[PDB]
Amino acid sequence: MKNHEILEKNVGLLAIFMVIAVSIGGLTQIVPLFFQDVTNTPVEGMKPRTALELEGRDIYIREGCVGCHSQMVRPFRAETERYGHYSVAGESVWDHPFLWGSKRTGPDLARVGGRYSDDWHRAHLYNPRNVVPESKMPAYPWLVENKLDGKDTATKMEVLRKLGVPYTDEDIAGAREAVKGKTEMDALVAFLQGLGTSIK
Amino acid sequence: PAYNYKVVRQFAIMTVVWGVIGMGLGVLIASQLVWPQMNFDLPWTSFGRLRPLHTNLVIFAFGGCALFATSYYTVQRTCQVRLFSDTLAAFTFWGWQAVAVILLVSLPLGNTTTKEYAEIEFTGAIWLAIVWVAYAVVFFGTLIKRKVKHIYVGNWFFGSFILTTAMLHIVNHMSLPVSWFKSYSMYSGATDAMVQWWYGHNAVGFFLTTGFLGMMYYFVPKQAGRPVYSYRLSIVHFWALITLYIWAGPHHLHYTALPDWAQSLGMVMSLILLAPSWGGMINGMMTLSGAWHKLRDDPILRFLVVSLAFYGMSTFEGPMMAIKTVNALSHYTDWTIGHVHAGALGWVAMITIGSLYHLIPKVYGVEKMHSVGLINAHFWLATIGTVLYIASLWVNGITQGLMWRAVNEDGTLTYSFVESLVASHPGFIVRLVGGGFFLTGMLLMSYNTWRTVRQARPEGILAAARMA
Amino acid sequence: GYLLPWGQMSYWGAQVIISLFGAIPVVGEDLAQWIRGDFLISGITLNRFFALHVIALPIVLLGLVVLHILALHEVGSNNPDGVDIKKKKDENGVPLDGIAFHPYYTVKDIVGVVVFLFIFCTVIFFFPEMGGYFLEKPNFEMANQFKTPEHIAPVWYFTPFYAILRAVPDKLMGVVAMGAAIAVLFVLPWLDRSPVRSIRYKGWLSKLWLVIFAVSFVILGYYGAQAPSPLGTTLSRVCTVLYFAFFILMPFYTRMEKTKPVPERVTG
Amino acid sequence: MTTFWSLYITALTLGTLLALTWLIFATRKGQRSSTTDETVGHSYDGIEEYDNPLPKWWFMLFVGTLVFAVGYLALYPGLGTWKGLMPGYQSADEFADKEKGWTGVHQWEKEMAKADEKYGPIFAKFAAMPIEEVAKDPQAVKMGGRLFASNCSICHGSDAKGAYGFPNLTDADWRWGGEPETIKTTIMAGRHAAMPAWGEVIGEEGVKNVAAFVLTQMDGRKLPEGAKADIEAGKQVFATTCVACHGPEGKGTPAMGAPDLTHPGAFIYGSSFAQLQQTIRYGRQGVMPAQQEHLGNDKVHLLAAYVYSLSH
Amino acid sequence: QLDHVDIDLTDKAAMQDGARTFANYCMGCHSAKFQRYERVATDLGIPADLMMEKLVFTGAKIGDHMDIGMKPADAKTWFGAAPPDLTLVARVRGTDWLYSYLRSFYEDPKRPWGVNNVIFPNVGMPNVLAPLQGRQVIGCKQVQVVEDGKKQFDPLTGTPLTHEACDQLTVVPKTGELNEAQFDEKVKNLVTFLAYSANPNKLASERIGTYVLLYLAFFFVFAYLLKREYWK
Amino acid sequence: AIAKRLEPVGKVCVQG
Amino acid sequence: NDGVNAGRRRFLVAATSVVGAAGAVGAAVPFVGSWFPSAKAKAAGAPVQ
Ligand SMILES: COC1=C(OC)C(=O)C(C/C=C(\C)CC/C=C(\C)CC/C=C(\C)CC/C=C(\C)CC/C=C(\C)CC/C=C(\C)CC/C=C(/C)CC/C=C(\C)CC/C=C(\C)CCC=C(C)C)=C(C)C1=O
Ligand code: HEC
Ligand code: HEC
Ligand code: HEC
Ligand code: HEC
Ligand code: HEM
Ligand code: HEM
Ligand code: HEM
Ligand SMILES: [Ca+2]
Ligand SMILES: [Ca+2]
Ligand SMILES: [Cu+2]
């Protein structure tokens, strides 16, 4: 029991032991997730988000909607009835970063694709209380004004392709034109409409 | 010969300053949740943008500066040596302040990685690693240049914290850049979720429990002037805690798309991890054996003891919420936030308050804080304001979980989501009031620290350091 | 040098500045023509100013810098406390508050040079125009002898004196006041009658008047960079009065004030 | 998951558990078995360790957590591809993906089967009667009300009176067909309005005169005092361009979704002179989500009965 | 009141369209004589043969300056004001001024060329982009309603809520090849090319400056260590 | 792509 | 001054000198490079008949 004193007298041995102890846990839960099919095989029928969908997801990231909304429907009957078919690992294979979230200040957005009209997302993302008087969602009446310049769309698509998302040169070339004159609200709504569309 | 108390006192002053700002910003976002009109329809002050700033300032600017202060102070005193290098010691202060300023200037602008506690983007997450390798050098070189034969338990906790929150930082920020402060994670979907939460559960537990457990191990016996309760318990606690906090990560993805074997592993490991955390709490509390009567005279010891009590409460709650049956009720509810602030206001904030109220009148040369009555008032305000926060968020989260899961005998859902929001609104107002109480306590400490910092003559600061 | 680019600002600023020499009551016009080398600003003036700017004034400046540093090293440097460190010397003859310029201040100046180069290269490679103040926008248009810019203003570092000249309604009086604004700094050493050197130990009056002078200089520069305005003109006149009062009243308010005792040893 | 990775998970997890057990058993080895007052010989800045034995209850708690761990990840999916031995579902093949063990999907399928058994008769009963009959059953109409509140109150209003742009399902005016069958079809297949934009067709002046004619002659409200309009020209343009969809009297055509243009209460996009001009100039093209896929024909039938009850 | 334009100097296609517009509609009167066809082709990614065939109309060589046959004195006599060289006009006026100026021409019979400019009143320039924009007049059109900065958009359609204003630039319908958005893009590409011409070293300047600043931070670290040490 | 982008505005119709 | 750390002083002086020399070379690059044939010089020439 006194052998522990050896680590007390040596900084190097203690550092090595701590490194190994912290590494054991991480190497068993993250490494195996790679090379595992269920977490890497996309659901049949999905395609990479369009350039405008990608920019809308980027705006969704910028406005920090992850802290309020979740995109992961758990396999519960109440959950699935409220939101729809439960999310699966194949739906997020091309999501850098994942936006499942851990807090629900508002309804889960995993299946809002096609649930509501574009004209609702607009007039709800411009003044949430206009359509839901008790909403605690912040108003976003600036996504209407500022318009996408398409500066980083090509580079963003190229980087996403480098990370494994199956984009094609026809998409990289056309990304700039796909967001030439469309407002930030348009992209943020188009990305919303595409959520959970692969599974119904 | 003396100690490099310059860096410790800079870190303490900046710890108070950053805690005040972070907690005021937290109160601001809570008010926004109560009244949406507190967003003022400005892009840079909306809840979605400011909330990440709150959660990254309280953890890294307030807690980080506190841990830097209590490590650069505890390591020297327990080793009887000056810090390894004053160069890197001062660099680890100025660069950490630069990191905090980057968080201030960037997160409101929307430059975020969406990773709960890795929101700092490219070229901001690279400087936080440059200034963390320097911190590790400064701490471990000091442990290398010791003038004593052993290494204290608190030193073990601090070193484990430092190494783990460099491995996690480099692993979770492994991304590709599109521009400055614009990045895409290299992990996707379930893999990205697993990496994110294996980093986020160690942003607590190691940044908020291990490093702060070392702060406890030093400042509890020192403040109470009594020996630590058990050496063997300290050994077991340290080793099991560091070997299980990494494992217990998958409990944040309990019923998500993550493979179920990982979820089961996470829950089981968290249930195991219950024991070492309670062992640390037992050591801290029983270190006060024969000295409980000092809680009536010294509010700092009350701070430390109540911090340990809330630590036990949080480390009992957390394993319970790691159970998938319990986690089903509370995974996206306010109960998660209630647990977070039970472990942060009750445990991290209180241990920080007690440790700085002891450290500040030792690196400045002044024998005592300007007003001990202010210390007692701050203790009472923090306690009434953490209890209020805990209770309000518990009620709120249980309500939302039940309402979302509530189903009528017909099979239709009993309640809509807006009904849950309106039912939670009273919880939101009570949370705002408790946060205001805690922020008032923080303001009182800032006034006490300002009045104690002034009236400390040049020599008084100089003699205090004199190595021993 | 600013004439050399031969832009609109170059040409017209040179025109006005050399017309100032036309304000001398008698020989003004002849002197201005002789300086120009032509009946107007032209390529003759351009080549002449180029020769002066490229050789003559660089040589004069190098010689003046040599003389300046030689005089300083003859009398020794001042310090922020105004303490005459030479009064207290050790057994080796070195001042107690003195350190060898090389290497200590050489390395300090190396650090300062690196910081300055960081700012300098940032400006060069990212903001060379500096909002049109380092490179004026109208100067990117070729000089036009027949069209003058809507508003012609000097480079920023000449703007304060310009404001002074613009603050005086009379032309010759304005030129004289602009010249005196620079000439008074020459007599500054005899205007200051304070028993102490550093502002740290001068009386409240000296501190107040230094603040007033700095603010007036900045305001004069700021309002000389824009087209004339009512508030601008009023503040320019007030700041001209204050700028000249900082010097004219120095011999008085340096005596009226009560100064702190200068420490025997430098503080720090 | 591959066999190699299953063995990886199993070996590492069991190694971690064994390491923790060995740590707790070795560190307690040689313990004095009694809280002592003899501190450890060394002092770190005055701090001292009591050298006390591990608390008996704490050690037993750690061992019990270890045992509970082993039991659970033996009973549940863990240690790689080791489906747990839970008797509830470690048998049979009633599940979708032919697996014998716990998962979120597996227990969810069990729960859904139980809930179907419990609730499907209710929906089938209320999904078989005519909408009119279902509309007069408190249980059925309250089910429909809860479905309306949880599914589409956010877009039709909490009380069934929509905000600007969304119809009022409580009033007597119906844009589309107000009959029960038409209501059910509207809730099932969704609706697209397709109101054309006349800004570039009849020009700004024409839009102005029309808007005025609709606002006064049809709606009945007065112009905003101080407005210029050609009411006769507005009527003339209406009789040619607008008369096709909205009836000669501007009373709408439920087949196309054209509303009653003579009532300001039906207008979901506004009734002011400016709002009418906006609608006529830039078109509206309202959208009704198709609620068939989202929640099924039984629930859509219940919702149709509920809205029928509210309106009539 | 100028209109903001977000000009992307890394957009080779936009700069190419702007260069085409400049070579066709602009070099009739305006020179870019401080800028060579060779450098323009190199920076815009235009092959030298393509630049020769498509943008060099004056018989100049690839390395020649973008000179034109119209002499400044002749043009000053003809128009009442000499058309300035446009190589640096983006720096002289800024890109926002150019964007607003090239879209602010409106018919004005009182003027020598029948047009005036909101940005440049009584300008001596004829409206040479009228065929593209179409007839623009100071008339009455729909403008978004604003009350003390309270700008109203349509919550549902996201389009502006408008009221009639009778002192606005209105393009007469079916009078130009390009609609408002297409002419906006044409003018944006032209102003992007002019911005490149005024500052052709911008992108290289940013790259070199980034590397210089990195080196200077490194050197500052070393100099600061050499100072604070050696000052003990 | 560039050639189409750079097409001269003036089009001339030529015999044959 | 008490016990100046030589070697550290020598290392810092040498490293600062080397980095400054690299910066001097970089700052010389514009001046040396501007002496190579410019775009004016590179006009070249066509065959003469
Ligand atoms: C809008 O507008 C405005 C702005 O703008 C935009 C402004 O900014 C401003 C604001 C203005 C400012 C603050 C800017 C201020 C700028 C300035 C100060 C610029 C001023 C510069 C000039 C105009 C230049 C003027 C130059 C002058 C007047 C000096 C002229 C000097 C000469 C010509 C030199 C004479 C040459 C000589 C004597 C030759 C040497 C002779 C010899 C004898 C050589 C030796 C010969 C021999 C040895 C042979 C003989 C032998 C001998 C002697 C025998 C013995 C032998 C021996 C050797 C011993 C204003 C107001 C403004 O509204
Ligand atoms: C990025 C700016 C965001 C987008 C895009 C959306 N949200 Fe939210 N959200 C929040 C609440 C309290 C609600 C209640 C219901 C309501 O307001 O209508 C919502 C709702 C939505 C919905 C509707 C989902 C549905 O099932 O009806 C959508 C499509 C939506 N939000 C998009 C809360 C918050 C929040 C907390 C302050 C933030 C930051 C966001 N929402 C951000 C976004
Ligand atoms: C709960 C699932 C819902 C029921 C039941 C109904 N809706 Fe809606 N709705 C919405 C709009 C914008 C319209 C206008 C359609 C158009 O412009 O042509 C409607 C219309 C209806 C109608 C017909 C009303 C009439 O007067 O004929 C019925 C019977 C109806 N809706 C039933 C908007 C929305 C919407 C926005 C996203 C939601 C989710 C729903 N409605 C949901 C329901
Ligand atoms: C592309 C079609 C063109 C652009 C872009 C510009 N020009 Fe011209 N222009 C012409 C004259 C006679 C003048 C002088 C008018 C006066 O001084 O009052 C101008 C002026 C400009 C300016 C103003 C620059 C300034 O610093 O004020 C700009 C920015 C400009 N032009 C851009 C004549 C002609 C012309 C002869 C028919 C043609 C074909 C063009 N301009 C074409 C363009
Ligand atoms: C069929 C091609 C139509 C013609 C031609 C016109 N209208 Fe119309 N209108 C039509 C539909 C299908 C709708 C429904 C819009 C929706 O989103 O539900 C409408 C609506 C209107 C409205 C306002 C609707 C509201 O406020 O709820 C107005 C004021 C209106 N219509 C008037 C109008 C005029 C003036 C027309 C000629 C210029 C005209 N309509 C033509 C169908 C059609
Ligand atoms: C053994 C100790 C602990 C365990 C097992 C534990 C477990 C958990 C669980 C089950 C959750 C729910 C996450 C979710 O459902 O999304 C959670 C969230 C969290 N708790 Fe703990 N907890 C412990 C102690 C602490 C402490 C001491 C702190 C602070 C000092 C803390 C702060 C947090 C944070 C920051 C989160 C993340 C919130 C989020 O997911 O958005 N926890 N923890
Ligand atoms: C007055 C004191 C505080 C107030 C009012 C406050 C308020 C809040 C609020 C409103 C949220 C978000 C709630 C939600 O999203 O539902 C939050 C989240 C969080 N806070 Fe604070 N906070 C305070 C102190 C602290 C401190 C001191 C810390 C750590 C040292 C901390 C750590 C966190 C964390 C980690 C989260 C993220 C929780 C999650 O994502 O689930 N908080 N806080
Ligand atoms: C323009 C080129 C100039 C150069 C290269 C130069 C150079 C120097 C240097 C190297 C020093 C010693 C270090 C220091 O005190 O900063 C110095 C000191 C000084 N300079 Fe300058 N100088 C210049 C212009 C001026 C001007 C325009 C003035 C005042 C009108 C001036 C007044 C002084 C004074 C009074 C001192 C010594 C004061 C003291 O020791 O604190 N110099 N100069
Ligand atoms: Ca999250
Ligand atoms: Ca969260
Ligand atoms: Cu956790």
Short mmCIF file of N, CA and C and ligand atoms in Angstrom, two decimals, chain A residues 67 102-103, chain B residues 51 116-117 197 337, ligand 10:
data_model
loop_
_atom_site.label_atom_id
_atom_site.label_comp_id
_atom_site.label_asym_id
_atom_site.label_seq_id
_atom_site.Cartn_x
_atom_site.Cartn_y
_atom_site.Cartn_z
N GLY A 67 -28.61 26.34 -27.93
CA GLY A 67 -28.84 26.48 -26.51
C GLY A 67 -30.29 26.46 -26.09
N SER A 102 -28.84 20.05 -25.84
CA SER A 102 -29.08 19.43 -24.54
C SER A 102 -30.14 20.15 -23.72
N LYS A 103 -30.78 21.18 -24.26
CA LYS A 103 -31.77 21.97 -23.54
C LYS A 103 -32.94 22.24 -24.47
N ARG B 51 -25.82 33.63 -24.23
CA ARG B 51 -25.76 32.46 -23.35
C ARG B 51 -24.43 31.72 -23.48
N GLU B 116 -20.76 22.95 -26.68
CA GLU B 116 -21.25 23.61 -25.47
C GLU B 116 -20.16 24.38 -24.73
N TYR B 117 -19.02 23.74 -24.49
CA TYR B 117 -17.93 24.34 -23.74
C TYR B 117 -16.64 24.39 -24.55
N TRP B 197 -19.32 15.47 -25.85
CA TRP B 197 -19.71 15.28 -24.46
C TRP B 197 -18.63 14.60 -23.63
N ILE B 337 -30.27 22.22 -15.90
CA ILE B 337 -29.71 23.51 -15.52
C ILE B 337 -29.68 23.66 -14.00
CA CA H 10 -26.93 22.83 -22.70
#
